[PDB]
Design an enzyme around this catalytic site. Structure first.
Site, PDB file in Angstrom:
ATOM      1  N   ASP A   1      -6.756  -1.945   2.890  1.00  0.00           N
ATOM      2  CA  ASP A   1      -8.103  -2.060   3.416  1.00  0.00           C
ATOM      3  C   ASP A   1      -8.548  -3.512   3.551  1.00  0.00           C
ATOM      4  O   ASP A   1      -9.623  -3.897   3.082  1.00  0.00           O
ATOM      5  CB  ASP A   1      -9.089  -1.284   2.542  1.00  0.00           C
ATOM      6  CG  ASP A   1     -10.463  -1.155   3.179  1.00  0.00           C
ATOM      7  OD1 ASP A   1     -10.595  -1.421   4.404  1.00  0.00           O
ATOM      8  OD2 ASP A   1     -11.417  -0.786   2.449  1.00  0.00           O
TER       9      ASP A   1
ATOM     10  N   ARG B   1     -15.150  -8.004   4.661  1.00  0.00           N
ATOM     11  CA  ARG B   1     -16.032  -7.417   3.642  1.00  0.00           C
ATOM     12  C   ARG B   1     -15.321  -7.284   2.288  1.00  0.00           C
ATOM     13  O   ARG B   1     -15.987  -7.152   1.259  1.00  0.00           O
ATOM     14  CB  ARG B   1     -16.528  -6.037   4.087  1.00  0.00           C
ATOM     15  CG  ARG B   1     -15.370  -5.086   4.392  1.00  0.00           C
ATOM     16  CD  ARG B   1     -15.804  -3.655   4.745  1.00  0.00           C
ATOM     17  NE  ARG B   1     -14.612  -2.854   5.045  1.00  0.00           N
ATOM     18  CZ  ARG B   1     -13.996  -2.819   6.221  1.00  0.00           C
ATOM     19  NH1 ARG B   1     -14.456  -3.529   7.259  1.00  0.00           N
ATOM     20  NH2 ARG B   1     -12.877  -2.103   6.350  1.00  0.00           N
ATOM     21  N   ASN B   2     -13.986  -7.322   2.263  1.00  0.00           N
ATOM     22  CA  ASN B   2     -13.252  -7.218   1.002  1.00  0.00           C
ATOM     23  C   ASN B   2     -12.748  -8.559   0.458  1.00  0.00           C
ATOM     24  O   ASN B   2     -11.895  -8.591  -0.422  1.00  0.00           O
ATOM     25  CB  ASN B   2     -12.035  -6.278   1.127  1.00  0.00           C
ATOM     26  CG  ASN B   2     -12.367  -4.853   0.742  1.00  0.00           C
ATOM     27  OD1 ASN B   2     -13.203  -4.633  -0.124  1.00  0.00           O
ATOM     28  ND2 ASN B   2     -11.689  -3.870   1.374  1.00  0.00           N
TER      29      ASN B   2
ATOM     30  N   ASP C   1     -10.408  -5.832  -3.478  1.00  0.00           N
ATOM     31  CA  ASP C   1     -10.318  -4.476  -2.936  1.00  0.00           C
ATOM     32  C   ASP C   1     -11.389  -3.709  -3.695  1.00  0.00           C
ATOM     33  O   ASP C   1     -11.176  -3.292  -4.834  1.00  0.00           O
ATOM     34  CB  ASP C   1      -8.935  -3.890  -3.179  1.00  0.00           C
ATOM     35  CG  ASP C   1      -8.793  -2.495  -2.596  1.00  0.00           C
ATOM     36  OD1 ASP C   1      -9.608  -2.140  -1.732  1.00  0.00           O
ATOM     37  OD2 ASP C   1      -7.861  -1.765  -2.999  1.00  0.00           O
TER      38      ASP C   1
END
Ligand SMILES: Cc1ccc(NC(=O)c2ccc(CN3CCN(C)CC3)cc2)cc1Nc1nccc(-c2cccnc2)n1
Ligand SMILES: CCCCCCCCCCCCCC(=O)O
Ligand SMILES: [Cl-]
Length: 287
Positions: A140, A144-145, A158
């Site tokens: 992912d 944003r991570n 994460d």
């Protein structure tokens, strides 16, 4: 587990009373993650805990176990755990500037120039090169991570945002919630995830960085994304982006996973990308 001679000794286990729990971090865009203070050091830390009676106890423990195995300047640093008994905690350093997506959107662009954006992208590729060689997959990757610290230091994290996130970032797909716009084609159509699907996501993350955090494929409806990608559509080179950077994005978005570069190759590409001319010179030439 805190007894040195014990065969169950875990140097990471710490006394949870050493930490003062404060408010939930970033409002709640991280779920059960709280700001805390490690009393003895007067150090602010991030503390992840488990939601009320959930069935992800094993995934939580698995995450703690995996974090004990990774150490890299560009991966969020594990500081300790409290998993001898409830409430379970995973404690990491606290990164001053928060998540990279909001940072890109709210930063002083004069300070966070093309050179700094390239530095951030390079650091992220360094963390992924590390996970790659240790046979881990992120699954992912997206701005944003990532977290931002002092001097534009960036660390890949994460936050298990899939279900925490609100809005259209993550949408229903294959029985789960997918951030469709960052998902490789084989992941979308065949649920195949690998370090190569992380590379595709990294290409999207590179586009996020190059646009100061714009949302990918703006105005395209998700229902047509796969057909478009299958017919070789790709986001065009964004305003001011150096041709070489865009070429790297295009390499990350090769249809066949096997055709995408490894993170080792991506990191090397960044280090030697502007040997004949500077990124600043290219960003002027392009404009
Ligand atoms: C408190 C905590 C607990 C766990 C984690 N975990 C990770 O960040 C992480 C990163 C990479 C991996 C590797 N893993 C390999 C397997 N694949 C499938 C998934 C990834 C695992 C966990 C981070 C944190 N830190 C964290 N979490 C949320 C928000 C913040 C935060 C927010 C604002 C300022 N400073 C920090 N900090
Ligand atoms: C690795 C990421 C580096 C990409 C750098 C791209 C920089 C683009 C500059 C944007 C200029 C916009 C001008 C108007 O405003
Ligand atoms: Cl993995």
């Amino acid at each position: 587990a805190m007894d040195p001679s014990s065969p169950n000794y875990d140097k990471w286990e710490m006394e949870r009373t050493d930490i003062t729990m404060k408010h939930k971090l970033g409002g709640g865009q991280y779920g059960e993650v709280y700001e805390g203070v490690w009393k003895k050091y007067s150090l602010t830390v991030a503390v992840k805990t488990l939601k009320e009676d959930t069935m992800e106890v094993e995934e939580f423990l698995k995450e703690a176990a995996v974090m004990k195995e990774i150490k890299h300047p560009n991966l969020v640093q594990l500081l300790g755990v409290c998993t001898r008994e409830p409430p379970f905690y995973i404690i990491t350093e606290f990164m001053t500037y928060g998540n990279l997506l909001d940072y890109l959107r709210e930063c002083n662009r004069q300070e966070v120039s093309a050179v700094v954006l390239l530095y951030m992208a390079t650091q992220i590729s360094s963390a992924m090169e590390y996970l790659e060689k240790k046979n881990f997959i992120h699954r992912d990757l997206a701005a944003r991570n990532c977290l931002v610290g002092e001097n534009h230091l960036v660390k890949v994290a994460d936050f298990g945002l899939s279900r925490l996130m609100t809005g259209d970032t993550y949408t229903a797909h294959a029985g789960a919630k997918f951030p469709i716009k960052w998902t490789a084609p084989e992941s979308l159509a065949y649920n195949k995830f690998s370090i190569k699907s992380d590379v595709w996501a990294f290409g999207v993350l590179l586009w996020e960085i190059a646009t100061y955090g714009m949302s990918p494929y703006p105005g395209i409806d998700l229902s047509q994304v796969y057909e478009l990608l299958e017919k070789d559509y790709r986001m065009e080179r964004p305003e001011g982006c150096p041709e070489k950077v865009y070429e790297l994005m295009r390499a990350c978005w090769q249809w066949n996973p096997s055709d995408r570069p490894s993170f080792a190759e991506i990191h090397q590409a960044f280090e030697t990308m502007f040997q004949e001319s500077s990124i600043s010179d290219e960003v002027e030439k392009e404009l």
